[PDB]
Amino acid sequence: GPLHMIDYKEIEVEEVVGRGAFGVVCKAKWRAKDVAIKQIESESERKAFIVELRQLSRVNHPNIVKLYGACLNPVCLVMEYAEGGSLYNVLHGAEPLPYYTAAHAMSWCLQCSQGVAYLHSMQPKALIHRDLKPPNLLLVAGGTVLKICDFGTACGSAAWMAPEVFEGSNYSEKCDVFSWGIILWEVITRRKPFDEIGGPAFRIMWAVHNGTRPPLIKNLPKPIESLMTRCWSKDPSQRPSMEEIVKIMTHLMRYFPGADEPLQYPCQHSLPGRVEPYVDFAEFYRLWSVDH
Ligand SMILES: CN1CCN(c2cccc3cc(NC(=O)Nc4ccc(Oc5ccnc6[nH]ccc56)cc4)ccc23)CC1
Numbered sequence: 628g629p630l631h632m633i634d635y636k637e638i639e640v641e642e643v644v645g646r647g648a649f650g651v652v653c654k655a656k657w658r659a660k661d662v663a664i665k666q667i668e669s670e671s672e673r674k675a676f677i678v679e680l681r682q683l684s685r686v687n688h689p690n691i692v693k694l695y696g697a698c699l700n701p702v703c704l705v706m707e708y709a710e711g712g713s714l715y716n717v718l719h720g721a722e723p724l725p726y727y728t729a730a731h732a733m734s735w736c737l738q739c740s741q742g743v744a745y746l747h748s749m750q751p752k753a754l755i756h757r758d759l760k761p762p763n764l765l766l767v768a769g770g771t772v773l774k775i776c777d778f779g780t781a782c783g784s785a786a787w788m789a790p791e792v793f794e795g796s797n798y799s800e801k802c803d804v805f806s807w808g809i810i811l812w813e814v815i816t817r818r819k820p821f822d823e824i825g826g827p828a829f830r831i832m833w834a835v836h837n838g839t840r841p842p843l844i845k846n847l848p849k850p851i852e853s854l855m856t857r858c859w860s861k862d863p864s865q866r867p868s869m870e871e872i873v874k875i876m877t878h879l880m881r882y883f884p885g886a887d888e889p890l891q892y893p894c895q896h897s898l899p900g901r902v903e904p905y906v907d908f909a910e911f912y913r914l915w916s917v918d919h
Pocket residue numbers: 644645652663664665679682683686691692704706707708709710712746754755756757765775776777778
């Protein structure tokens with residue numbers, strides 16, 4: 628695909644906006660467009676940068692972060708800046724946190740599935756994310772458009788990780804489906820998966836390996852529960868494909884209007900077998916029965 632070689636003189640570096648496993652991400656400008664640049668900080672890091680650059684060049688989708696180009700001196704990636712920050716931050720970040728709706732929760736999960744389904748349907752060889760979680764989901768367009776990315780890990784992903792991955796089996800693209808199942812629960816409940824557990828990360832791995840999943844949700848539509856709990860399955864072959872998730876979720880959006888309303892209202896918080904959803908399903912059930 629069309630990957631621009633870039634002159635660092637033309638980039639107007641403004642400020643640091645967090646960082647990944649390697650490198651430091653900075654907000655900048657470049658030919659009158661807001662850009663996130665991921666600059667390298669030691670000559671040692673170039674092998675990983677090449678894999679990242681070769682990956683980002685292949686992918687071209689509305690729900691995966693767009694690489695504009697890369698400067699080879701000094702070595703940096705140049706991506707479209709996502710103003711909204713991570714989904715992790717919108718859900719769990721610093722107060723004041725934004726209000727959002729079941730429609731938003733479903734639209735984020737739909738958009739994420741669309742992006743992963745694109746990765747999975749790629750040729751000659753299918754790409755697998757293997758680290759799908761809200762810190763790697765960026766928001767744009769007032770919190771309404773979600774973009775998959777990967778900040779990378781050094782050596783916290785345990786909560787969203789499929790059991791077959793962390794147990795050192797042969798994993799497949801069905802590990803992404805597991806992760807998505809957990810993200811869906813997370814955006815619906817606005818709870819971090821496994822804070823009831825806590826302690827070090829191997830506690831979560833152990834828990835999940837013995838069958839522990841997140842708790843079920845009071846008054847969750849049976850169809851959404853069916854989908855969610857299939858994605859949690861120990862056996863990877865019993866989880867749906869992303870093609871299937873995208874089709875289902877696309878169709879459920881009929882009963883979840885208002886996903887294009889930007890996040891703009893504030894929210895104040897409390898936390899109680901089951902758990903209450905943060906979002907409200909009254910309107911879903913209302914719209915559903917009108918059809919059925
Ligand atoms: C085995 N692989 C697993 C993952 N793979 C990947 C799949 C899809 C996207 C990927 C993006 C990458 N790169 C990437 O997204 N880097 C990156 C992420 C965030 C970032 O920071 C921002 C970018 C834009 N707006 C921002 N606003 C605040 C930070 C920020 C800078 C670089 C790296 C890998 C990717 C394929 C197979």
